[PDB]
Design a binder for this molecule. Structure first.
Ligand SMILES: O=c1c(O)c(-c2ccccc2)oc2cc(O)cc(O)c12
Ligand SMILES: O=c1c(O)c(-c2ccccc2)oc2cc(O)cc(O)c12
Ligand SMILES: [Cl-]
Ligand SMILES: [Cl-]
Lengths: 215, 215
């Protein structure tokens, strides 16, 4: 009834898996080959022709951020957004902030030397804003448990850790971002996340490969 | 009680005015000087330091797309989004699609000659997808009346018309995009929009000026 088209290393696909598993929704994972895309993926998502795509009752929903809100509205139990409109707007604001800065991270895989060290400092600054103004002193962006904001920022855990190791740069460190680093450790320790993350060695292998073609 | 910080020519500020006026919400418009920004705008929006910013009960909400959903949730009467989760996801999807392509339009103010004619054809293609897959045969993106999707695409009416006249290119034409062009005319004819759009001559003067510095 619920099908998920996506990659086994994509952080965007994992956001959807986390949300469905937090809701207790049974789903079939359909592995999408990037070199040979199926007839379903080209008709379900004709605009971007990219993953992830959620299919519910044969109807497709693309773009992980739209998918996350569809899951929240379709399965309202175990809420992943607050009910207060101002708090919901702040959650949307931080999610959009992360989505806009998912471009400054690309410079970590293209630049080198003193140009790479400039890109790393820019990413640290983006993370510091998120830490100070978004997370604050809460355990999670969702307060005492993870919400859509934590899910949207989960890529700053093992995916960012793999990029840091592939490019030889340090960005999310305890000395510079103590609260965000403590959050990243707590996020990965949440049993739902721990049981549903890609193998680090396989993910690191992929990030090294991506860095290679991006120079 | 409700204050709006924004520009008198910005399409993003007009989206917010339309939504507040469709809800019957009394608000004070605070004109924001770009050369000399007030102490309020720098504290209310410390992340982008940009307009528009809605302030409700002294609390700021930035980013027109987050603001539009806050207005919809705070004043739920006269709905501007459908109740069905799939239809709401499709509205969010098209809004995000327009927000992502609000970069291909920038090439209309930077390129010239055969490079400008390439940018115009790219924008026509973006609009054709919106027309075929988003609008279809409906009078408005919201069906029989305007919704958040129409509001988010209102910049394709007189703002796009001013860019077309400033750059000497044709993008949204009746021969090539008949349904989207008919929509653009119907949108501008809606009394709420007609009574709340910038003066065309002043807007054209601004677009010519923006084209100048962007080359
Ligand atoms: O833009 C990103 C991206 O596309 C992917 C990715 C990795 C593996 C497979 C497919 C996609 O991971 C990221 C991880 C990040 O910490 C930051 C990003 O900016 C990205
Ligand atoms: O990105 C845009 C933009 O910033 C403005 C603008 C105009 C006047 C004053 C302030 C902002 O208008 C647009 C109009 C469009 O049809 C498309 C755009 O891509 C834009
Ligand atoms: Cl995505
Ligand atoms: Cl905006």
């Amino acid at each position: 009834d619920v099908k998920l088209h996506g990659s086994w290393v994509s952080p965007f696909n994992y956001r959807v898996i986390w949300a469905l598993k937090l809701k207790g929704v049974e789903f079939e994972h359909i592995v999408e080959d990037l070199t040979n895309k199926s007839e379903l993926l080209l008709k379900y998502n004709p605009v971007y022709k990219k993953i992830p795509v959620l299919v519910h009752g044969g109807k497709p929903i693309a773009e992980s951020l739209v998918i996350l809100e569809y899951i929240e509205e379709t399965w309202p139990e175990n809420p992943l957004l607050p009910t207060d409109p101002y708090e919901r707007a702040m959650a949307r604001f931080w999610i959009q902030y992360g989505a806009t800065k998912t471009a400054a991270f690309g410079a970590l895989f293209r630049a080198s030397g003193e140009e790479l060290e400039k890109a790393a400092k820019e990413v640290v600054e983006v993370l510091r804003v998120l830490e100070e103004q978004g997370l604050g002193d809460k355990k999670f962006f969702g307060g005492d448990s993870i919400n859509l904001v934590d899910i949207s920022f989960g890529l700053f855990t093992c995916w960012l850790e793999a990029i840091e190791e592939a490019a030889g740069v340090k960005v999310l460190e305890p000395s510079t971002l103590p609260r965000l680093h403590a959050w990243a450790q707590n996020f990965i320790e949440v049993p739902l996340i721990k049981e549903n993350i890609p193998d680090y060695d396989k993910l690191l292998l992929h990030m090294k490969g991506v860095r290679e073609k991006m120079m």
